[PDB]
Amino acid sequence: EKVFFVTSPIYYVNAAPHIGHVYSTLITDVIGRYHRVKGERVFALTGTDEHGQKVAEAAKQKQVSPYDFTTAVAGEFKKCFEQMDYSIDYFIRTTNEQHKAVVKELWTKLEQKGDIYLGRYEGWYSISDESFLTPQNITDGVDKDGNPCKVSLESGHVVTWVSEENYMFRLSAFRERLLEWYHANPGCIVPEFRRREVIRAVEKGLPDLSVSRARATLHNWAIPVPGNPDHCVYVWLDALTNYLTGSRLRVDESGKEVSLVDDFNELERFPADVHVIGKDILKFHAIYWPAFLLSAGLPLPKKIVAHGWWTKDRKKILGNVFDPVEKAEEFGYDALKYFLLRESGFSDDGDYSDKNMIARLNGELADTLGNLVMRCTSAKINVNGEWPSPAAYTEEDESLIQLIKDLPGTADHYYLIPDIQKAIIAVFDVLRAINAYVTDMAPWKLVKTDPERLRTVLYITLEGVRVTTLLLSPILPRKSVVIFDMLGVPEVHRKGIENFEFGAVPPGTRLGPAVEGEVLFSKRSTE
Ligand code: MET
């Protein structure tokens, strides 16, 4: 056992935070929350990528110091994530002095291993992606002016020709070991088609990789190469190292880093159990990073999960915004999170209209979950305001019980893939089954007609709501608490695999107090 270590990418601070960053960090957050619910030690990590030409030039364009610009924008990222109400354990910044030391330490290992030489890069480079590209991965496009230029096929951003004496990492020498790693861990990249992409790309051959740049090109906004002040460390080698840095930082109660340990084993976090990333940055994580780790003799991550990129009303996000805080203030924080995790799987296919948002809010959160919670806690149905003791189970009772008992196992596998969408769907399939059982039994009639039968129906329903809610708690962290409070579930029973079990809450447990205008999810007007 070790600390379950989950990460998000660290984001460029060239501009203000937006939905892409909020989405990636949310996924990271949800994975961490699920493992805490299982009672595991978790360290969840996010942060900002603050060096490089991209960032330094964005600061120049605003006519501000790189130190002042990065600090200000990093501040906006922290404020946004705070407001999004994640449970991230640490926010790292690559300008941190302790991160810097770790980067120099990793570089030195790579050099001492013989995997870094002085050579030349002569080729295309995308500043906006901080990415080296071959002629096969560029094409014709236009400037900011509208003059003809070359652009990345990858991303569409302008590319430039670089010809510089650079320190080069021997990535070509790691091809075989990388292929061995992919084939021996066929779950290590998710989803499967991105795993195939990576293997196909590495099968073709790998060139060596420039890991430094001449200091002027960078506007001196980068980590100097140890032993050679004319060169700065490639922003991506610096950036990827944040995962190692974060694995080695002791953090105090307020979230401040207070100490860098010498050895990752001391904190038991490294290597990451899951790196959450966008598809745009797959090669850095699935090819370069494991190669750096193999060179350094460090263990490799267990999973890399790469999600897709987004649209609002089937259009690129100018004249089309999606501010997550404003949407969350509009429809709800947990509701917005549910929507983002339910609507998209590993694709760009998601309908992010306010229409579809309202349809899921009303249909799934309000009509399926909320209505159910209200039914089984209603004083008109649950006359004694408690968990009743069930009488004998019918076959129908048992079919539903069986679904509830099976759910934790199924949801668990989905959370570990990870495929959060599938986990949510599984839980809601069980919520729908519970609703249909309740409709079929009509407990409102049973109050008058067979109060004994009602004890059974009502107990099964409460327990189905409790289990589904426990498994939804990583997705609806605030609302799950409210639900548990309404059900009167003691704190101890709100986490731990012990409580995945059917029957964990005893009969006789009292419900929470009923507030005057109780409303868990408010249906919105279709507009
Ligand atoms: C080590 S993850 C670095 C990600 C990069 N800063 C980006 O925003 O795409």
- Domain end point (choices 316, 333, 352): 352
The β-bridge partners of 44 are 6
C-beta of residue 418 within 8 angstroms of C-beta of residue 190: yes
Same domain, 393 and 403: yes
Helices within 38-96 (DSSP H only) = 53-61, 66-83
Separation CA 474–CA 43 (nearest Å): 15
C-beta of residue 264 within 8 angstroms of C-beta of residue 126: no
Cis (ω within 30 of 0) for the bond into 271? yes
| Count of other CB atoms within 10 angstroms of residue 133 | 19
Residue type, 456: T
Q: Residue 476: which of 9, 33, 19 has the closest Cα?
A: 33
Number of structural domains in the chain: 3
Same domain, 498 and 444: yes
- 3-class DSSP state of 278: strand
Separation CA 56–CA 70 (nearest Å): 9
Same domain, 19 and 77: yes
Model resolution, angstroms: 2.3
> Would you give the distance in Å from CA 2 to the centre of its chain?
20
Helices within 142-284 (DSSP H only) = 175-184, 192-204, 235-240, 242-246, 282-283
Residue type, 152: S
Pocket of ligand 1 (CB under 6 A): 9-12, 49, 239-240, 242, 281
| Pairing of β 148-152 and β 138-142 | antiparallel
What's the gap in Å between 77 CA and the centre of ligand 1?
14
Nearest atom, ligand 1, residue 11 CA = 8
- DSSP conformational letter for 224: E
What's the gap in Å between 15 CA and the centre of ligand 1?
13
- 3-class DSSP state of 525: coil
Nearest atom, ligand 1, residue 9 CA = 2
> Would you give the distance in Å from CA 174 to the centre of its chain?
29
Separation CA 242–CA 95 (nearest Å): 10
Same domain, 40 and 126: no
What's the gap in Å between 1 CA and the centre of ligand 1?
29
CATH of the domain at 215: 2.170.220.10
Q: What is the residue range of 22's domain?
A: 1-114+236-352
**Token couple for 299:** 């263990």
Same domain, 175 and 195: yes
Range 227-255 burial, b when 16+ CB lie within 10 A, else e: eeeebbbbbbbbbbbbbbbbbbbebeeee
Beta strands in 293-379 (DSSP E): 303-307
Q: What is the DSSP track for 26-52?
A: HHHHHHHHHHHHTT--EEEEEEEE--S
What's the gap in Å between 414 CA and the centre of ligand 1?
26
The β-bridge partners of 151 are 139, 158
- Domain end point (choices 218, 235, 252): 235
Separation CA 108–CA 114 (nearest Å): 10
C-beta of residue 285 within 8 angstroms of C-beta of residue 275: yes
Separation CA 45–CA 40 (nearest Å): 16
Same domain, 470 and 344: no
What's the gap in Å between 54 CA and the centre of ligand 1?
12
Separation CA 33–CA 39 (nearest Å): 10
What's the gap in Å between 504 CA and the centre of ligand 1?
43
Q: What is the 3-state secondary structure (H, E, C) of 376-395?
A: HHCCCCCCCCECCCCCCCCH
**Token couple for 97:** 């002095």
CATH of the domain at 488: 1.10.730.10
Q: Whose CA is nearest to atom 5 of ligand 1?
A: 11
The β-bridge partners of 69 are none
The phi and psi torsions of 8 (rounded to 5 degrees) equal: -110, 165
CATH of the domain at 44: 3.40.50.620
Task: Give the side-chain half-sphere CA count within 13 A for 295.
Answer: 24
User: Torsion angle, CA of 9/15/16/21, rounded to 10 degrees?
Assistant: -20
Probe ligand 1: pick from 6, 7, 11, max atoms within 8 Å of CB?
Answer: 11
- Domain end point (choices 352, 381, 414): 352
Q: Whose CA is nearest to atom 8 of ligand 1?
A: 11
Cis (ω within 30 of 0) for the bond into 418? yes
Helices within 417-476 (DSSP H only) = 420-441, 443-449, 451-472
Cis (ω within 30 of 0) for the bond into 191? yes
Which residues, 6 or more positions from 4, have their beta carbon under 8 angstroms from its beta carbon?
A: 32, 35, 40, 41, 42, 43, 273
What's the gap in Å between 285 CA and the centre of ligand 1?
10
Separation CA 31–CA 274 (nearest Å): 9
Nearest atom, ligand 1, residue 48 CA = 6
Q: How was this structure determined?
A: X-ray
Which residues, 6 or more positions from 318, have their beta carbon under 8 angstroms from its beta carbon?
A: none
Q: Whose CA is nearest to atom 7 of ligand 1?
A: 11
| Count of other CB atoms within 10 angstroms of residue 135 | 9
What's the gap in Å between 45 CA and the centre of ligand 1?
13
C-beta of residue 47 within 8 angstroms of C-beta of residue 92: yes
The β-bridge partners of 119 are 166
Same domain, 389 and 484: yes
Nearest atom, ligand 1, residue 277 CA = 2
Separation CA 137–CA 450 (nearest Å): 72
**Token couple for 519:** 């409303």
Range 492-518 burial, b when 16+ CB lie within 10 A, else e: ebbeeeebbebebbeeeeebeeeeeee
> Would you give the distance in Å from CA 176 to the centre of its chain?
30
What's the gap in Å between 126 CA and the centre of ligand 1?
14
Probe ligand 1: pick from 7, 45, 49, max atoms within 8 Å of CB?
Answer: 49
Task: Give the side-chain half-sphere CA count within 13 A for 251.
Answer: 18
CA angle 326, 327, 332 (to 5 degrees): 110
> Would you give the distance in Å from CA 268 to the centre of its chain?
21
Q: Where does residue 65 fall: left (phi above 0), alpha (psi -120 to 50 degrees), or beta otherwise?
A: beta
Same domain, 226 and 251: no
**Token couple for 152:** 């990345």
Probe ligand 1: pick from 25, 154, 279, 281, max atoms within 8 Å of CB?
Answer: 281
Separation CA 18–CA 507 (nearest Å): 47
Same domain, 26 and 127: no
| Count of other CB atoms within 10 angstroms of residue 357 | 21
Task: Give how far Cα 345 sits from Cα of 30, 340, 420, 480, Å.
Answer: 14, 9, 8, 23
Same domain, 328 and 225: no
What's the gap in Å between 276 CA and the centre of ligand 1?
11
Task: Give how far Cα 96 sits from Cα of 23, 60, 253, Å.
Answer: 25, 21, 19
Same domain, 268 and 318: yes
CA-based torsion, 429, 433, 439, 445: positive or negative? negative
Q: Residue 498: which of 524, 467, 527, 472 has the closest Cα?
A: 467
Residue with tokens 């107990």: 459
C-beta of residue 99 within 8 angstroms of C-beta of residue 239: no
Same domain, 358 and 229: no
**Token couple for 158:** 């302008």
| Count of other CB atoms within 10 angstroms of residue 434 | 25
CA angle 31, 298, 50 (to 5 degrees): 65
Nearest atom, ligand 1, residue 129 CA = 9
Q: Residue 52: which of 217, 229, 242, 225 has the closest Cα?
A: 217
